[PDB]
Design a protein around this motif. Structure first.
Motif, PDB file in Angstrom:
ATOM      1  N   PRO A   1      -8.819 -35.040  -4.212  1.00 22.98           N
ATOM      2  CA  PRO A   1      -9.898 -34.337  -3.499  1.00 22.98           C
ATOM      3  C   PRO A   1     -10.426 -33.164  -4.196  1.00 22.98           C
ATOM      4  N   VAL A   2     -11.727 -32.956  -4.142  1.00 17.52           N
ATOM      5  CA  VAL A   2     -12.312 -31.696  -4.612  1.00 17.52           C
ATOM      6  C   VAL A   2     -11.586 -30.551  -3.864  1.00 17.52           C
ATOM      7  N   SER A   3     -11.015 -29.610  -4.629  1.00 22.71           N
ATOM      8  CA  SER A   3     -10.303 -28.466  -4.056  1.00 22.71           C
ATOM      9  C   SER A   3     -11.234 -27.432  -3.322  1.00 22.71           C
TER      10      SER A   3
ATOM     11  N   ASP B   1     -11.922 -39.556  -2.594  1.00 19.17           N
ATOM     12  CA  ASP B   1     -11.264 -39.557  -3.928  1.00 19.17           C
ATOM     13  C   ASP B   1     -10.215 -40.688  -3.985  1.00 19.17           C
ATOM     14  N   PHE B   2      -9.707 -40.984  -5.162  1.00 19.19           N
ATOM     15  CA  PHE B   2      -8.827 -42.108  -5.268  1.00 19.19           C
ATOM     16  C   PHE B   2      -7.469 -41.904  -4.560  1.00 19.19           C
ATOM     17  N   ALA B   3      -6.941 -40.682  -4.528  1.00 20.30           N
ATOM     18  CA  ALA B   3      -5.680 -40.481  -3.811  1.00 20.30           C
ATOM     19  C   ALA B   3      -5.794 -40.717  -2.318  1.00 20.30           C
TER      20      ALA B   3
ATOM     21  N   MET C   1     -22.701 -37.579  -7.517  1.00 25.18           N
ATOM     22  CA  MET C   1     -24.051 -37.623  -8.052  1.00 25.18           C
ATOM     23  C   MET C   1     -25.022 -36.712  -7.251  1.00 25.18           C
ATOM     24  N   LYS C   2     -24.615 -36.291  -6.052  1.00 24.77           N
ATOM     25  CA  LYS C   2     -25.418 -35.316  -5.308  1.00 24.77           C
ATOM     26  C   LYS C   2     -24.977 -33.870  -5.665  1.00 24.77           C
ATOM     27  N   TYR C   3     -23.692 -33.613  -5.654  1.00 23.09           N
ATOM     28  CA  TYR C   3     -23.192 -32.258  -5.904  1.00 23.09           C
ATOM     29  C   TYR C   3     -23.394 -31.770  -7.282  1.00 23.09           C
TER      30      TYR C   3
ATOM     31  N   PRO D   1     -15.272 -23.531  -2.640  1.00 23.01           N
ATOM     32  CA  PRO D   1     -15.225 -23.193  -1.222  1.00 23.01           C
ATOM     33  C   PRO D   1     -16.411 -23.626  -0.343  1.00 23.01           C
ATOM     34  N   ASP D   2     -17.589 -23.809  -0.920  1.00 21.75           N
ATOM     35  CA  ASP D   2     -18.776 -24.269  -0.188  1.00 21.75           C
ATOM     36  C   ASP D   2     -18.865 -25.804  -0.134  1.00 21.75           C
ATOM     37  N   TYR D   3     -17.854 -26.544  -0.614  1.00 15.29           N
ATOM     38  CA  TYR D   3     -18.106 -27.988  -0.829  1.00 15.29           C
ATOM     39  C   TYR D   3     -18.567 -28.749   0.456  1.00 15.29           C
TER      40      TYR D   3
END
Length: 121
Positions: A37-39, A55-57, A86-88, A44-46
């Motif tokens: 996952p994106v941390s 994510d793969f996990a 592709m958006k972020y 922090p704004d994700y």
């Protein structure tokens, strides 16, 4: 019932096939950009940008709980990985470019998976 058992055997076998699909797709990410996952500590704004992170996990956790009923559900999650990235990230980034390559290479794998799922039933 015997029918519930048969249904459960089918799900177990789908899970076997999706595990092999997942391994093959994740090999197409040798940089491990999509592994975790994106941390939210580091970005922090994700969640203001991306409403359904993937994510793969996270997919592997779902898979091992037998939480994919069909290949469509599995593909939905794989497409989220790609589409969120592709958006972020902008076009000129290693992240966007990794997602394009993963999409292109994964297509082949998923094309044959669909034939196998239909073929074996």
């Amino acid at each position: 019932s015997m029918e519930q058992v048969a249904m459960e055997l089918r799900l177990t076998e789908l899970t076997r096939l999706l595990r092999s699909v997942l391994d093959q797709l994740q090999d197409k990410d040798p940089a491990r950009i999509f592994a975790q996952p994106v941390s939210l500590k580091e970005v922090p704004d994700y969640l203001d940008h991306i409403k359904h992170p993937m994510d793969f996990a996270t997919m592997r956790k779902r898979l091992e709980a037998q939480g994919y009923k069909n290949l469509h559900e599995f593909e939905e999650d794989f497409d989220l990985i790609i589409d969120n990235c592709m958006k972020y990230n902008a076009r000129d980034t290693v992240f966007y470019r990794a997602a394009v390559r993963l999409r292109d290479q994964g297509g082949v794998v998923l094309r044959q998976a669909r034939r196998e799922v239909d073929s074996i039933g």
